[model samples]
Target: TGIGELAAALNEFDNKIILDPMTFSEARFRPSLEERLESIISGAALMADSSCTRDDRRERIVAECNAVRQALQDLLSEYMNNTGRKEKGDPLNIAIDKMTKKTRDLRRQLRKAVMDHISDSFLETNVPLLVLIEAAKSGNEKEVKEYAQVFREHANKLVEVANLACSISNNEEGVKLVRMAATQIDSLCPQVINAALTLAARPQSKVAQDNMDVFKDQWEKQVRVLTEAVDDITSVDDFLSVSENHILEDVNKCVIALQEGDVDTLDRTAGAIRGRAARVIHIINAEMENYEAGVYTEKVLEATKLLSETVMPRFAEQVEVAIEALSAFEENEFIDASRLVYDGVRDIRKAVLM
Candidate 1:
């Protein structure tokens, strides 16, 4: 519900915030402005309640949302002040510029939230399917039913999150493609569930197993298609920002796993960190390809290169060493190594956003 409110707030922001210089100068103070501001305020409140943890990253965003709200109030008061003949060029232009800049900042922050949703929710895309399949293979109809519910919820979330990405993205064609891909996932979900049910009914039959495999592959293929389509439409800046956050979280877990002497958690978390860093490198390099050779492109490409060539290799070695040491008897090397990987990704995001 909180996420929904956040989405609603974002959508209201996109639709109602008046940013045009011309429009701002001529538009009268309508009563609807008051209502819109109220909606945005109410919607913005949801972020505080929606997440599991208190997010420091959202601090400025919440502040910026208030900034925009204040700007709106300023605009309204200024509009009221200019009830009679007023200066056309100076007074409103400055207000409009402030409003425009603040609104644009808010929009960027909202996109980051959307990207965070995308990055976090789209992970383990195949896990629910695999879990449902395993339940079917065990021939437990009750467990299959239970997992079927979980599986459908996962499918709905993918579709919903894909649409959220589309709302923030400007790629018209890519948005359509993503919408279609989401629809495919939504429609195929029940069919996949039915196959799971069929397999559960006859777990010993080779034919049922083959049928289940086909649906599994099809589901996997469609999800990949949807994932790629969303990735295509999302901004690289937001992607890197989300990646940095995810890496930091993984780094926290890696440290925790080390303290607990849980080699398995350490290996898995470190591998996840490596994969995420590799993805940042991959996507950013591909994005840099669209630009001509220049300082901006060079800066971003250099960050990716450092992460890939320098940081990742060392992090990989540290993960290996740490895992081995944990199995036998280690944190100093890995602590610095994991921190560097995060620093590396942050450098990439900073350069790209710069």
Candidate 2:
């Protein structure tokens, strides 16, 4: 929840910061930023809630969460204090860029910490069991034994992490099922080890190979169930916010790729931007339906259409023109097209906030 608030604040200010040198003046925009800081402070209680956090570290996490908010407040205060100074040129730009960088760096770290808080404890730990099973199938007893231990630890880790997910979550049925699935995996681990040993005993035996396959299928299925259960309880708002920030980061990469004339990086990074924008469009369209036909809904729809119909076409054409010939790539054209998209996103966010 707090993560989403910070992302909204940063995306809003990103454009506002650029506008500062042009058409805007001080303090009018500061309210939204301050409110975002407050939103994080309110959701900050998630860290303090002892039912979720570890007992030993609960004291530390809670204190740190508060400290982070205070630091953010201080950052905001400093920004406003320096807002109206009649300054420009290299020195002014450098100072502005420095404060902007520091502000964003702090936000990124805080967002990551919140992401970790909501992340699945059993994230990607189940992959090694497949390695162990394959080694057994190949009748590599030495490799099988080594991987058996790894697979065992993987299973143990899942059990601990599974409970960790359950602790943070409040959904009784979801948590119950996750615990049941996790406990099943724990019990199944020993059987999996025994099956590997059996496959090792007889290299080409179908019965041993069949046993390994069955267990492998069962383990992965349970893992998926656990994964889905965790997703069901996590914050959708926070996820969307984090995803948008990632897209913003990639936009800069695309900017650099175009300048350096690196076609491969340009291809991959531009593809990501298009993909993420499509996702945002689809999700936000659906998300807007929760509100009636009004200012908020209308403004977002306009913003979405602006990007889909106008800005993205310009962006795609900019890419097309650039690669056709270097001389065809007008730098200002590329910048204008991309700038419109970011500005559109900012408009959509403002409407949502309204």
Candidate 3:
């Protein structure tokens, strides 16, 4: 008989022999015994070979083999008991227990193998993407290009995982991982282009000048896009908050114009500087209008005290110097006094920002 038929007969014999105390030993020596054992062993070998071919099918076959082995072992034990050789069953029990343990260990190994395969495949695929994201944020051209190289090395591996996952019907997880990878690609593209432009603009090169002109055009386009984005982010306030560096840079430009005795440039620069200061004052006033008198009040008081003691005096001194220089210029009608005023304004700008 085939494996399935032998397995069925073995199970029935196991139950019958275990219940029939008188004929159990004789039952064990039945003429079909050798044929049944041969069929079962062959069947198990076939199942093991088939199991090696596929993951899911292997697990199912192993489980069936375990059941058949257990039934055969019970039949052997029944024979031992009926023959008054129950003590001899100790070795059989030990062997059966060892086999069971081995089977369990093999199962665990299979599970671990599957998990490791999946994790390795995922790392080979996803790590490149993660690297690309990091490179985009690196702010260094060499590092970005190096990372791009690493990403290219693993591109085929990533595609392989994408295909494998798709084949297994893990559509959602596969798609999500791929989308994350695509996002990194998208983010890196602009950065790569920017880095290439930077490289082209290396100092003392003819290409540098050309690249600079190209960059200026690109910058203007970018600014227009940014302005549109900012417009979409609506607010009641007309003025946007600016960094202290913004004030410092404008002040520095004004100081340079003053020192050069460029009256027209000085006037334009000073107007912008004062306009920003006025906006800051307006914001402070608006904030104070609805101010509460508690921790915020104490905090403001402390801030004012600190400003007066450590900050304001220095600024006042610099402003005084600038005014004195300006008066000297007015009285003597000398342009050289403009340089003194410019130096004082530079000091005042530093004091304010600091």
Q: Which stretches of candidate 1 lie over 4 Å from their true place?
A: 1-28, 40-54, 262-268, 285-317, 327-329, 346-354
Tell me, by TM-score, which candidate is best: 1
Q: Estimate each model's TM-score.
A: 0.81, 0.43, 0.21
What is the full ranking by lDDT, best candidate first?
Answer: 1, 2, 3
Instruction: State which candidate, 2 or 3, has the greater lDDT.
Output: 2
Winner on lDDT between 1 and 2 is: 1
Model 3 residue 248 CA deviation in Å: 1.8
**Candidate 2 local Cα displacement, residue 261, angstroms:** 15
Model 1 agreement with the true structure over 124-149: per-residue lDDT tens digits: 67889999999999999999999999
Candidate 2 lDDT, 175-233, residue by residue in tens: 67777777788788888899888998796999988888888888788777765555554
Error of 1 at 292 (Å): 6.8
Q: How much lDDT does candidate 2 score?
A: 0.62
Cα displacement (Å) at residue 293, model 1: 8.5
Quantify all predictions' global Cα lDDT against the true fold: 0.77, 0.62, 0.42
Residue 150 C-alpha lDDT in model 3: 70
